[PDB]
Design a protein around this ligand. Structure first.
Ligand code: HEM
Ligand code: HEM
Ligand code: HEM
Ligand code: HEM
Lengths: 146, 141, 141, 146
């Protein structure tokens, strides 16, 4: 993957402003609500019984944070995402058997969450750069399948 | 398809969108063209520069059809029947492109009306865009 | 969903399958487990060795439900309502797995009845398996 | 990708028996019939108006043959598919903008066509080896996207 100077600016500039606990919690909660089969993977998180319980489940909150903070590892070094995400690829593919399509769905949700928080500042160009990043991260996660 | 709760939720979000449907139409297309450049191939005869009259005119029509489907939520295949022939028979739009546009629309809603797009409304609106997607790719044979 | 032509075509292929539905049930699962090993994760408590009684018993039930849906093609959501709760609410089967199984079934049909699976019947049977897929993943909330 | 000795045997052994004109024509015809949006890519092939016209269209027949014969390039060297399909990846991704999901759909159709021709001999294991091959070929075709 090649990153442009502008794409790097849009990514690193938004990353500094991102509340990872808040966006992370919301992104994972929306995943479980909008695509309910994803709940099977998180059965051990306790009460996932309604949107409100999912939203106020502490393990959901905490895991969502950890998902989003691991995007910082990508932001840190954008030209080395493939190798940075190799262990997490093994985890998701060999242990959990999460179908790659679900990586795409969480990426799409993250983008909606970012949009709702940053509104006006979430320009078409900033969206495109962020879409590219979740796509690259999803592809890095799916590499142990190939 | 759509529960009574879903229909309430979709009517709910679209009421807030209201007078802005046209602008949101244009904004959705602009984001789609930028974020998924492969969609540009279906509009070779368009001016796709930012804020072009062609995008605004087309955006208005896309939004208008969505509003019409909302107003006829109980029978959307009927409300959009002419549009299914155009998209499925004539243009042969790859189904995947309806997911791109549905996603850009949800992004536009979130930007302008974040408090209205609760997780529950999100889930309903996604189902709705999926329902519209399937109708417009239907009559393929 | 399904045209009158599609329904004719699906009834057509299933009539030829007829008395073999059970065996084809078992064969479809065996191919799915082998070709898409990730599906094995939904059956941790199964004996998945070739020709196991557990696969044959389960295969019979899967085929039986498909036959029942065919016999009620005009209302399959009703015919399979109990099965949607099980697959969508309880088991939370990832939608992608229904595509794997639908594909293995079509492979089984082609092996045993190649002359019956004309391109037209193929297109109808694919739509049908997709329709069954969507019903069984429906009630997700 | 790693190939087993058995997988190689199943692939090379079936390849020698495959009628590439017949299976190729059928596979591409079924693609256009079962997934009709794929017809947009082949508009220049003339009459695609009904299943019978699609089936008896000469350019459909000839292109289907060329698609299947290019699987021989893969069979020839199974450990070098990525590089063998690099040019065709550029063609399909940069010029034609064919969404990768369609590579999967043609692969799935090819498998059904193989099954109908080889019936009894198309064992679960032979299917699995062939499924793996179309998956690997599809992934090689989609590499210019990443
Ligand atoms: C594409 C974006 C994703 C990222 C960046 C990501 C990242 C992570 C991280 C950092 C962990 C913790 C690993 C550790 O403990 O060291 C994790 C675990 C996990 N992930 Fe993901 N993940 C993604 C997508 C998904 C999806 C789509 C699913 C399934 C719907 C999923 C299911 C899980 C599960 C079940 C765990 C273990 C839960 C636990 O025991 O705490 N992940 N992931
Ligand atoms: C919610 C989904 C969609 C809706 C409601 C929608 C609605 C419409 C409407 C109202 C028209 C104009 C028909 C007329 O002028 O009489 C149209 C045309 C068209 N659509 Fe869509 N559309 C959708 C998705 C898409 C997608 C995803 C694409 C491709 C990426 C696409 C490509 C086109 C093209 C190329 C035209 C013709 C433009 C022209 O030359 O005038 N549509 N659509
Ligand atoms: C055409 C699609 C399918 C049909 C018609 C179907 C039908 C059935 C039937 C009839 C049962 C038994 C219910 C009972 O015993 O009362 C069942 C259960 C089950 N299904 Fe499916 N099924 C389909 C797809 C799938 C898929 C794709 C998977 C996962 C890969 C799956 C996983 C399961 C599991 C784990 C059970 C419970 C098994 C047990 O412990 O008894 N099903 N299904
Ligand atoms: C995954 C399996 C596929 C393989 C192995 C394959 C292979 C090929 C080959 C060998 C050619 C001829 C290249 C040349 O002239 O040197 C070609 C061209 C082409 N392919 Fe594919 N292809 C595949 C999938 C697809 C799909 C899914 C589509 C779209 C639905 C597609 C659309 C086209 C088109 C439009 C051409 C040019 C047609 C022409 O001008 O003759 N291909 N492909």
């Amino acid at each position: 993957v090649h990153w442009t100077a502008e794409e790097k600016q849009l990514i690193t500039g938004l990353w500094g402003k991102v509340n990872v606990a808040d966006c992370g919690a919301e992104a994972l909660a929306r995943l479980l609500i909008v695509y309910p089969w994803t709940q099977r993977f998180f059965a051990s998180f306790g009460n996932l019984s309604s949107p409100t319980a999912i939203l106020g489940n502490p393990m959901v909150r905490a895991h969502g944070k950890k998902v989003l903070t691991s995007f910082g590892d990508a932001v840190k070094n954008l030209d080395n995402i493939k190798n940075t995400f190799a262990q997490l690829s093994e985890l998701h593919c060999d242990k959990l058997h999460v179908d790659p399509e679900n990586f795409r769905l969480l990426g799409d949700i993250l983008i909606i969450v970012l949009a709702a928080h940053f509104t006006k500042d979430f320009t078409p160009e900033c969206q495109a750069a962020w879409q590219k990043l979740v796509r690259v991260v999803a592809h890095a996660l799916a590499r142990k399948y190939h | 398809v759509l529960s009574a709760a879903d229909k309430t939720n979709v009517k709910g979000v679209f009421s807030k969108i209201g007078g802005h449907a046209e602008e949101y139409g244009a904004e959705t297309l602009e984001r789609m063209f930028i974020a998924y450049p492969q969609t540009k191939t279906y509009f070779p005869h368009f001016d796709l520069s930012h804020g072009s009259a062609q995008i605004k005119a087309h955006g208005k029509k896309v939004a208008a059809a969505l509003v019409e489907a909302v107003n006829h939520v109980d029978d959307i295949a009927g409300a959009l029947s002419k549009l299914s022939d155009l998209h499925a028979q004539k243009l042969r739009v790859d189904p995947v492109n309806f997911k791109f546009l549905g996603h850009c629309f949800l992004v536009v809603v979130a930007i302008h009306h974040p408090a209205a797009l609760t997780p529950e409304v999100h889930a309903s609106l996604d189902k709705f865009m999926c329902a519209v997607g399937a109708v417009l790719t239907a009559k393929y044979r």
